[PDB]
Write a protein that binds this ligand. Structure first.
Ligand SMILES: OC[C@H]1O[C@@H](c2cc(O)ccc2O)[C@H](O)[C@@H](O)[C@@H]1O
Ligand SMILES: OC[C@H]1O[C@@H](c2cc(O)ccc2O)[C@H](O)[C@@H](O)[C@@H]1O
Ligand SMILES: *Cc1c(COP(=O)(O)O)cnc(C)c1O
Ligand SMILES: *Cc1c(COP(=O)(O)O)cnc(C)c1O
Lengths: 807, 807
């Protein structure tokens, strides 16, 4: 047992054991003679859950009595991962439960692996919402996460013949012990219909009704006895030939059936629009209901803050207006004032293919009243623009919420800026780019609205939970206060020359690598050398993230070895993992390329154990918790200006891996905090990318001047990596040579050179670890607690608290 | 008084004072009432000189008794600089003399400034010979420096209208107290004539005779009581209408009149050839004379080692053969064996315009016998090549000592390789380049001959003498042993975190900068800001050294300031100094450009004291001793592969300045010793340069893709820096754009970026100094004591000794 894992008191261990047996008997209806590991997992989950209830009920009762300003975080994604360990950590029950299960003759680690990941998200945006809920609870904010309870989350990825195969993520199959259905709070949501203009106001009639049933999941703060709520809505058909009518109920319930598996890509499908309005409509009614139970809505913004995670829940703006104007009968101007002061919008990308632009004909059929409200909002907004910039007709066209052309569309991002009192980017460089390019016109009109809130990650799940060994050696030196005040890691700088510490940090990493190297053989049949440098790139597969650049390097290393076999080179295990969106052809071709390279490299006798290429299958939160602690090198090589922030980069930094990356997103602030000398930065900066675009990017030029690059392209083209199918990678080569939007070749030389400097430092164990300590010691700024404290003070207008609520 | 400067004993101070007064009276024939500072300088010089005599006579007597192997270093250049302080340092008389002169009411520092530099050299090659003599004496080797006593050394440089003006360096005007004329050892040297082939051997007859009169100068080792000799020959006409015949004696004496002012450039003038044979002929007779007084010449190589400093003294090979064969009557094969085992050759450059290729018609008229011997050597050599590489006729052509064509020439470098048992480069990268390119054929034939001997500098003149403050704070921590065992500076690494040391190192530098900033106003009328970063590039003006790249950066800094005047930038004083060879037009245009930039930059009100451009006039050894200790940034930016070694770079490193440079010459080994992280490396490596040449260097490409570079070129072309003469710099621009052999534009971007990282570190005083300490601490390898110990053991076959000879 380690200190950070809490006390294993005699009274508590005894209590846990009896409650465990009580649940196994009464709850699971089983006896030790027929119970399986899954049954044991559930008995434990129910036991731990019992400890949350008391705090959950009192926290909510507390908010009712004190009536603080409530924070509503609306998101279509909450990438939660597993809940058992995180709950034990936040309640300081980990050692007690470890001990109790030990005494019952069970291995708690084994049971934890049985829990299904709650994969209600795609990647960064979804996991950010999850980290935020943890921090909001840890900072004592009266916050509520609101989203959709998808029956099927992100698909489970299977690799067949080196190709990605998708299969339904039936995460609710065995039940979810963490959620509590609240059928009594079911609310109606309207679709279609038409608008009627009577004497006293407009009415939305003849609508199709879909019920929204909420499921509440507890969100415990870190050892402060605060337990907030994440409310997820489930679609249900109202109860009102016969057989077919009953079977068609599934049409309405399909709304909460599956999570769209696109990350950073907009797909204008009706079902997706229905999901977006569904979460918005149910949530707002719940918000208003709670408010009226605290009617002049003038105080609404003083009691309510609604944070829009990207534009997905943007309909909250016109829906709030609809309710205040049509139902509460407030005048437009009063309603608009309340709406703007209540809403805030967070942008997460600048890529054009990711911005939401809904066809007017769709909103026209599905939400006729909202379209009218949007036109009105647009009308009044453009009048403000016209008055501020008289005669600038092109500005009017550029700022309009309505986009003209082949098919009229509504720019949801413009709608969010107009209807929010605050708009923020997620990293300094990203926020600046927003003001300089994408939202320049809006920034000129209302400079005060634009802010920055650099992303962060929770040190609970991303350090204590996944890397106990590191959290322990750190605690031994500076105590445990850093877990909820990560800035204290700075105190570790005074140990950079401490021989003992250096030895421990290195030891922890080695243990993590052995543990992971073992895991890889266990549940996947792959052997790797634990002494090699663990070079990993895990994140969704996308061209802008440039897994292809990583591939080029790997192939370069291979060609160099084959060129001079008996020459020494630092051993490396190159691990790449991530899912590709089902309809993203190029993403799927890249995965194939990666496995294809592995097929060649991993079986070349001459390479030996000096180079290994492994594709990490089904990358997800639970897997991230395993690979990150075991990494030595973190690949964050997106083309400068494309990765808004990135969060995986922060996880790696906090866990003892060095970073090789471009000056993109949060990498810039990370390098700034640790010192550029302690980072492996390379490639074009944003400015260099623009210059190249002015000039015109011609990949052929690099192909002609770099022999090693040429050799690689010719290997791909000739079928060196695809014997049976010589032209298998023709699309990739064609893209790289003629239409590479991300300039892979432009950063190749500097990337390869930078990688050489990495290998050089790895040869000096002591100095590599010392640099590691300098990174870990300055990763404090990247805690989501800092991020949330900034949102709270600069946007929501509430003060975070570290005060413990009574037991 | 500081410790490293020795003891100021009461008996010695009293003795020095009386001897000072004795010389002022009896030697200078003056009294205190009419004595000027110069008279005082001479009284002091004679007093210090008296202390050398006893040791000088005993050292030579010692070599006579013990009869060790003698080392003869032949060089046409010995860039000695001043001798007074160096002598006091090596005899540990500095404090005593400081005290004694103080008591007589005189400032010793003032008197030292009166001594004329012995400028018998151009640059690096000449100063290397000087450092070598110091180290050979310090290592107790029986070594003799042999050269020419030029009446006029390197010209004194005057800047008029921003242009270089040359004026005779009449360094002997007031007399040289250090030398001792030895008219009794005068030797005859022959020129012209013809060859007669009699029965028993060939005879060189009807020659013109020129006498060689030697002047001996003492070379004291560091506190070991060893005093070696530097013998310099002076040309004298034999004593045998009347008036004109007497006046024409000057024709013969013109041989030792002036030093050719070319550095790294071959000028095939007859007078230069006469100088080369003159030093060789007189020296060899002296060597043989001394040997016969120690006749089977089989032991000659066991008692004699002749080191050829470049090809300038290459005629030593055929001259030795001439003497052994024609005069001593040894058979050719025996004579050749002795010659090869006796001679060793050091190459100092790979630039084609620097290699000596003498026209056959000149050697034919001036040295008919030597030409015959050279043909014979060539003949027998090519027979060896033919036998080793049968049928390779092109190799025969490439290796021939005789070059065919428009005008037959003799490749002196090929002659040296054939007639020497050892050939060495002066830095690892240079030595490798010799084996891979320039002398590849020779390396293949005789791989054993090729070696490397990385250059070094003497820590006596280049640390103790010019930077007493630094030598003192170092001695305070690790003692004084490092002065003759520089590797001990490593011990300073354990003080890199020592707050006291950091403060002292920084303090010493600040004092040096104040001292120099003051000097600049004193004897030159220029004011500078002592708080700015001292950015200096001092060395001979040449295109390969790329002072032009430095200029481009300076202009860039200026344009950036003018662009954003109120933006903060680290203040800089950019100092550039160096002489241009009289006939090197481009070199003279670069000097003009530098002063022209200064004229604009230094008088722009907006720049203020943030940027200053100063051209250091008349750069020479005595000036180097002043600027180097005061530098913060050392510019060593030659195009990769062109600077064989460089030595100025080492001086700066030993004196606390950081280095920004290319991976050229010794810079590579310096970075390797200190760690690349503690060096500011940038630009193309040798390999990148070759790739560019394969491809074809097109400067226009850089001009088109870099706006800042374009702006600079257009400023130069339009006359921005030359109002009255708008096209004044047309030649420079034309060269840069169409025929730049050194690829200035190719390294511009990376250079400017690297300079930004320098400015960034300078903003952090503590970390800049810590990096400085890491440099100084690892500069040990660059002591000429290490270099000479390697020559001694690996080439000359003698063991260095640190044993003190009796008083
Ligand atoms: O802000 C959390 C992360 O959100 C990511 C994201 C943005 C979207 O518009 C859609 C999906 C998605 O995962 C950005 O790519 C990351 O850079 C950023 O760190
Ligand atoms: O070896 C001492 C230095 O000799 C220099 C030199 C070489 C020549 O062939 C002629 C003159 C001259 O000064 C090289 O340029 C330096 O790189 C080298 O460090
Ligand atoms: C942290 C995380 C991400 C975000 O990673 P980036 O590299 O910033 O894209 C995506 N997926 C999972 C499962 C994560 O844990
Ligand atoms: C050391 C020295 C040199 C050689 O300098 P580099 O930069 O190596 O060319 C030339 N001249 C003088 C006066 C020197 O002291």
């Amino acid at each position: 047992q380690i200190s950070v894992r809490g006390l294993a008191g005699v009274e508590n261990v005894t209590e846990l054991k009896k409650n465990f047996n009580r649940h196994l008997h009464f709850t699971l209806v089983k006896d030790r003679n027929v119970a399986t590991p899954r049954d044991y997992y559930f008995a434990l989950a129910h036991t731990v859950r019992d400890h949350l209830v008391g705090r959950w009920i009192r926290t909510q009762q507390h908010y009712y009595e004190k009536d603080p300003k409530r924070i509503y975080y609306l998101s279509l994604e909450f990438y939660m991962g597993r809940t058992l360990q995180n709950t034990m950590v936040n309640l300081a029950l980990e050692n007690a439960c470890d001990e109790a299960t030990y005494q019952l003759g069970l291995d708690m680690e084994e049971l934890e692996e049985i829990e299904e990941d709650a994969g209600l998200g795609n990647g960064g945006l979804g996991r950010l919402a999850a980290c935020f809920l943890d921090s909001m609870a840890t900072l004592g904010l009266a916050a509520y996460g609101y989203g959709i309870r998808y029956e099927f989350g992100i698909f489970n990825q299977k690799i067949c013949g080196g190709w990605q195969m998708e299969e339904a993520d039936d995460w609710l199959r065995y039940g979810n012990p963490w959620e509590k259905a609240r059928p009594e709070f079911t609310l109606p949501v309207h679709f279609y219909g038409r608008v009627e203009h009577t004497s006293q106001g407009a009415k939305w009639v003849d609508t199709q009704v879909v019920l929204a049933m909420p499921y509440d999941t507890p969100v415990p703060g870190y050892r402060n006895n605060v337990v907030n709520t994440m409310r997820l809505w489930s679609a249900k058909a109202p109860n009102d030939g016969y057989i077919q009518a009953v079977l068609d109920r599934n049409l309405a319930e399909n709304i909460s059936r599956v999570l769209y598996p696109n990350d950073n890509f907009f797909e204008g499908k009706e079902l997706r629009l229905k999901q977006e309005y569904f979460v918005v409509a149910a949530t707002l009614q719940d918000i208003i209901r709670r408010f009226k139970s605290s009617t002049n809505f003038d105080a609404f913004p003083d009691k309510v803050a609604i944070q829009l995670n990207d534009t997905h829940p943007s309909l909250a703006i016109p829906e709030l207006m609809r309710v205040l104007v049509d139902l509460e009968r407030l005048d437009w101007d009063k309603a608009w004032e309340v709406t703007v002061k209540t809403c805030a919008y967070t942008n997460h990308t600048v890529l054009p293919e990711a911005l939401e632009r809904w066809p007017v004909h769709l909103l026209e059929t599905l939400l006729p009243r909202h379209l009218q409200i949007i036109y009105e909002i647009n009308q009044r907004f453009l009048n403000r623009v016209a008055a501020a910039f008289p005669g600038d007709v092109d500005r009017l066209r550029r700022m309009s919420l309505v986009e003209e052309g082949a098919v009229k569309r509504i720019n949801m991002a413009h709608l969010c800026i107009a209807g929010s009192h605050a708009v923020n980017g997620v990293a300094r460089i990203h926020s600046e780019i927003l003001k300089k390019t994408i939202f320049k016109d809006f920034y000129e009109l209302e400079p005060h609205k634009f802010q920055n809130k650099t992303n962060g990650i929770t040190p609970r799940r991303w350090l204590v939970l996944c890397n106990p060994g590191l959290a322990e050696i750190i605690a031994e030196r500076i105590g445990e206060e850093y877990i909820s005040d990560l800035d204290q890691l700075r105190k570790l700088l005074s140990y950079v020359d401490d021989e003992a510490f250096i030895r421990d940090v290195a030891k922890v990493k080695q243990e993590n690598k052995l543990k992971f190297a073992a895991y890889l053989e266990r549940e996947y049949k792959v052997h790797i050398n634990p002494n090699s440098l663990f070079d990993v790139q895990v994140k969704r597969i996308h061209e802008y993230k440039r897994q292809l650049l990583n591939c080029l390097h790997v192939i370069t290393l291979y060609n160099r070895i084959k060129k001079e076999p008996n020459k020494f080179v630092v051993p490396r295990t190159v691990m790449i993992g991530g899912k590709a969106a089902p309809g993203y052809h190029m993403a799927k071709m890249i995965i194939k390329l990666i496995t294809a390279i592995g097929d060649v490299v991993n079986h070349d006798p001459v390479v030996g154990d000096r180079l290994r290429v492994i594709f990490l299958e089904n990358y997800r939160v639970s897997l991230a918790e395993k690979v990150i602690p075991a990494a030595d090198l973190s690949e964050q090589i997106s083309t400068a200006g494309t990765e808004a922030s990135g969060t995986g980069n922060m996880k790696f930094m906090l866990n003892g891996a060095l970073t090789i990356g471009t000056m993109d997103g949060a990498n810039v602030e990370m390098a700034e905090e640790a010192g550029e000398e302690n980072f492996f930065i390379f490639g074009m900066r944003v400015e260099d990318v623009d210059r190249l675009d002015q000039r015109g990017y011609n990949a052929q030029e690099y192909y002609d001047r770099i022999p090693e690059l040429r050799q690689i392209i010719e290997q791909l083209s000739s079928g060196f990596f695809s014997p049976k199918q010589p032209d298998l990678f023709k699309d990739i080569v064609n893209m790289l040579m003629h239409h590479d939007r991300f300039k892979v070749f432009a950063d190749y030389e500097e990337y390869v050179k930078c990688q050489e400097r990495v290998s050089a430092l790895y040869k000096n164990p002591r100095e590599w670890t010392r640099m590691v300590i300098r990174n870990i010691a300055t990763s404090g700024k990247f805690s989501s607690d800092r991020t949330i404290a900034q949102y709270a003070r600069e946007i929501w207008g509430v003060e975070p608290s570290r005060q413990r609520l009574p037991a």
